[PDB]
Design a protein around this ligand. Structure first.
Ligand code: FAD
Ligand code: TFB
Length: 493
């Protein structure tokens, strides 16, 4: 028999969406004054973000001409090309007298170097080489260094601005015993390096490491409890003891949903190690896109109480959504372990944030998001009288820095003065594929905030719309609250 909290997690695994969403709504709802302040802040953040270098303003002037002289696009370009040429005439008199007398982003790929389709048909082995090269080219912006020494030697610039770091030695899903052993050695090496760089700064101000359980056990995806405890656990314990010796945070990343249960069993055992008594540097990620998330929080609150520590909890939405949907459709079970509409995940995240903020003695919440509304909502939900150890934000390298440039830093310089920990992937091209693919899915999805904010045609108010209000609007149109995505039927259907 499971504990009361562990049993509740199990029962919520694939809860119908109507039910799960309906239950979250009032926990996610911001009180009117808070909601109004969250909106104003969210709008302001998104406005400064979108309109650094005057993007909307420039797009506006371009429309106004392209509207006036009833011109098309390509005409506008042609007109600008001429205008540029006329402006290169050194003397104004001379100038005035002269006057009066599949392949979507092929453009962006161009700055690097129909008619395209045929061109592709020809050369099609070069595909395998194309894929590897496009991976490196696109993945570079997301990587902080090839080695941990390199990544760490780049830390000062933002750390002196009040940013923090969590380093990730890229690579996951070890296939062989040898692979897992190599990941173990890489993590150990990394902890020594990060710990020496940290130099006693501690789990809050100083850098930490993020690890993947799938890297530390071969074929983790189908591994049984007994072997995981016998082989993976002693490794997890050894790394955590080493992190503690250097007093740095060690965070257990969250991966596929069918590994949630075993990861909790590992965390449970870890928190009761005598050598970790009184130390609060253990971190654990929870994914708000799962129906189980609020139930996992109740479990974690009880675990912190029983094991007498403050847990570092990273609340995220989740990185594996596309694969989770595909997996559930293959398994043919009674439902999905994740929500099927993005706005429901948003609602879940806010309800979960409130739960975490209510227990500051038990949990240090780490709010990972690139979404300006989510950030503004958490900022208001955390209440008056911020203190640094209350919570932090987190962001991925290559995605979060512009938004967080408005957040981390001095109030005098126009910032919110809230700390942000940057997640810093470290590795060579051989380790990059899986992480890169997830970033493509995140950045390229039309439901993603980072995709929607780039679209100067989507009004700011829509971009930062309250998710609870959005869910009620759907419910009034559709006939009940929390209906699944119309294009994502149940697996058995
Ligand atoms: C520092 C950091 C660490 C992270 N660590 C982890 C981790 O260990 N494990 C992990 O799984 N994730 C992790 N993530 C989250 C993941 O990588 C994405 O960055 C995150 O989900 C983006 O959320 P958002 O608030 O930035 O963006 P938003 O655009 O607000 O939200 C996007 C998210 O919505 C969800 N979503 C998209 N479509 C749908 C849909 N149709 N139905 C329901 N939900 C949908 C997905 O979770 C998607 O990522 C981490 C993120 C950060 C910043
Ligand atoms: O790997 C990923 O895509 C997420 C983001 C960071 C850790 O888990």
């Amino acid at each position: 028999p499971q504990s009361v909290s562990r049993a509740a997690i199990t029962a919520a695994y694939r809860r119908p969406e109507t039910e799960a969403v309906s239950m979250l709504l009032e926990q996610a709802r911001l009180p009117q004054p808070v909601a109004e302040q969250a909106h104003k802040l969210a709008y302001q953040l998104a406005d400064k973000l979108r309109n650094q270098k005057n993007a909307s303003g420039r797009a506006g002037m371009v429309q106004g001409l392209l509207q006036e002289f009833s011109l098309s696009s390509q005409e506008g370009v042609a007109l600008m090309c001429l205008a540029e040429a006329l402006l290169r005439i050194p003397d104004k008199a001379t100038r005035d007298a002269l006057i009066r007398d599949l392949f979507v982003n092929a453009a962006t790929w161009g700055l690097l170097f129909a008619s395209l389709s045929r061109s592709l048909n020809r050369i099609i082995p070069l595909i395998r080489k194309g894929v590897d090269m496009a991976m490196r080219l696109m993945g570079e912006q997301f990587v902080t260094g090839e080695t941990i020494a390199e990544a760490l030697a780049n830390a000062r610039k933002l750390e002196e601005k009040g940013f923090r770091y969590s380093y990730d030695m890229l690579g996951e899903a070890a296939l062989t015993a040898a692979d897992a052993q190599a990941y173990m050695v890489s993590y150990q090496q990394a902890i020594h390096a990060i710990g020496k760089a940290s130099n006693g700064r501690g789990i809050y101000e100083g850098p930490g490491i993020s690890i993947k359980l799938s890297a530390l056990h071969p074929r983790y995806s189908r591994a049984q409890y007994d072997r995981v405890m016998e082989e993976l656990y002693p490794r997890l314990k050894s790394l955590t003891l080493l992190a503690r010796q250097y007093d740095i945070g060690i965070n257990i990343n969250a991966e596929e949903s069918d590994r949630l249960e075993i990861s909790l069993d590992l965390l449970e055992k870890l928190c009761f190690e005598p050598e970790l008594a009184g130390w609060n540097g253990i971190g654990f990620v929870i994914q708000a896109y799962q129906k189980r998330c609020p139930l996992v929080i109740d479990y974690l609150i009880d675990l912190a109480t029983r094991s007498r520590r403050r847990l570092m909890i990273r609340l995220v939405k989740g990185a594996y959504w596309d694969s989770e949907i595909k997996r559930a459709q293959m398994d043919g079970l009674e439902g999905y372990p994740v929500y099927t509409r993005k706005v429901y995940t948003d609602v879940s995240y806010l309800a979960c944030a409130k739960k975490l903020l209510a227990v500051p003695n038990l949990i240090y919440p780490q709010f990972a998001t690139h979404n300006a509304h989510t950030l503004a909502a958490i900022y208001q939900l955390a209440g008056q009288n911020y203190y640094p150890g209350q919570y932090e934000f987190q962001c991925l390298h290559g995605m979060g820095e512009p938004l967080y440039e408005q957040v981390t830093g001095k109030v005098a310089d126009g910032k919110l003065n809230r700390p942000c920990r940057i997640y810093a992937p470290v590795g060579t091209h051989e380790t990059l594929l899986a992480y890169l693919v997830r970033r493509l899915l995140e950045n390229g999805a039309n439901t993603s905030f980072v995709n929607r904010i780039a679209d100067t045609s989507l009004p700011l108010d829509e971009l930062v719309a309250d998710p609870v209000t959005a869910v009620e609007k759907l419910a009034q149109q559709e006939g009940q609250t929390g209906l699944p995505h119309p294009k994502i039927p149940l697996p058995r259907d």
